[model samples]
Target: HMVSKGEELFTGVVPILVELDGDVNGHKFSVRGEGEGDATNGKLTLKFISTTGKLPVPWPTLVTTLLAVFARYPDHMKQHDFFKSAMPEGYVQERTISFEDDGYYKTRAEVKFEGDTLVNRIVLKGIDFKEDGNILGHKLEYNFNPHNVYITADKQKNGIKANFKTRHNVEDGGVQLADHYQQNTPIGDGPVLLPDNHYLSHQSVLSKDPNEKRDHMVLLEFVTAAGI
Candidate 1:
């Protein structure tokens, strides 16, 4: 129930390739990221993040579900440059969606930008779980919180400002888990300044508030589409 796909779909599209891996109650999972975007004008700057696409041979069932979902995107969008080359494998052009695999909530996103805003969205559409990774699940320990961001351009020529909203009211993806701010705190500062087809990585350590011991590690990087 993360950010639902709706009418807000915008002008320029970007193909975001996302990968997330961490431990939950003693289990490891999926590899982690890639993505692409397009710029419509000089004044419209954006800070966006996303996830999607194909794997090598011997595909995982997770890929199956994602491809199925990917098939339904707008035909023109599929034909778009960023849509075609940005994601060579496949893509799911929507918000954060999770699939239950190996008892862990695997997350993915379909990242894009529209007009003046980063659009408060993520392309983690069909992220699924894996049998590989590290953690102690017997204790039922898993920490994840996925959310969307609306990054805005600065009129003063400063950095773009990002405002995040909790997606689906669930904590299940790196975008939120790796997010430096705690709930009710996303209103604070957290954003990127440039967009030269580079990456912005924010890694985090999960732990119980009572103790600082790191129980889990998370990886989340926002890789821009080459042209944008």
Candidate 2:
């Protein structure tokens, strides 16, 4: 069971759910990324996940599912810009989230950053598939962003961090997937530091782990000026 891993990826921050149209041959994709902070200031941690979906399916169903997932592009951009425009100068940072589509190929990208600098970014790309002569399934592969540093912090300074979690499935010749994550305030160095005693004290309900079942989750806590 990937439950334990799932729990570590979820919880902590608010989630933004995007809906899309269901179709094939032409699918829609969305992009969103930004940073947030308070007056006194702290960095935010973000996690991304693909929660609902299917796998090992036919081409039509696969394409349609992808379309539905991407249909929320326009709105995502709007929100992305709004968050950037609302932040305080010198304190707030903005990251670029790029989208690309061309016939049989499509992709989405975003740069990850600390308070005001770059760490790394991710690019997710997909391609169409076709059945071969054998009685086997079609093959659809894409360029996945290398597990590069999406977040980074200086040696003595604290910085924001981000990650992603996803779930996939194959049902009735179609596929569905969900992406979500948790956001924590800066911790363990410039932007935010994790508490000394922070640990996975309880179980989580949304855990993807198959062996040990859990009910709740605890975000990595940090000690602030007021004592967290």
Candidate 3:
């Protein structure tokens, strides 16, 4: 959690690791900013990723997508105490369930852009999965439209779009996942492994009821803007 170039302002951001009473083993979440000569654009970029241990987890795509939508961009990782004062209503505790393939494990990751000072909404549609005897297959049918995010200062903020199209289907009881990873980025540090300092600041985990047929959720979330 080095501030890199700018002065490290430890305000507004939430420290989720302490608040949630969780620590990283293999999965991790991180935030980084670049102004001049740091990244492609002279703007800050926040990225997050997770892994599905030694068992073929069925929903890394869902996890990563939610992270992009709900994670707070804090000034530092230890400012979680501030979150308690701001979010007195408390956040939700999400349960990440997994399915095994034969006996091995797998991992997955995704990245989204937090446009300049605006609330963004991520929509996921057309999710289909199947399990036959000992084989499993799944596909996430969706699209990323930056215009869907609501922001006030479009002139001062940059809108970034993340389009994810991936499938995770087991073959002969073997583990499999998507093969798209960004190079030399915060999220590139493997799945399910958030080891540095930051963690899930604010999150809402939405899952389908075991008896339900279709899976859909409208997540209502709130957080500080730019860790103010």
Winner by TM-score: 3
- Put down candidate 1 lDDT per residue, 120-201, tens digits, no spaces: 2221222223444211122122332322333333325322333233211122423212121111111213222222222112
Q: For candidate 1, give the lDDT of residue 215.
A: 25
Number of the candidate with higher lDDT, 1 or 2: 1
Give the per-residue lDDT of model 3 (tens digit) for 69-188: 223344453332222221222222222223232222222222222233222222222112234323133332222111111112111211122222233434434334332221111222
Deviating ranges (above 4 Å) for candidate 1? 1-13, 35-59, 64-228
Error of 2 at 206 (Å): 14
Worst 10 residues of 1 by lDDT: 176-185
Q: How far does residue 123 in candidate 3 sit from its true spot (Å)? A: 15
lDDT (Cα) of model 3 = 0.26
TM-score of each: 0.22, 0.21, 0.24
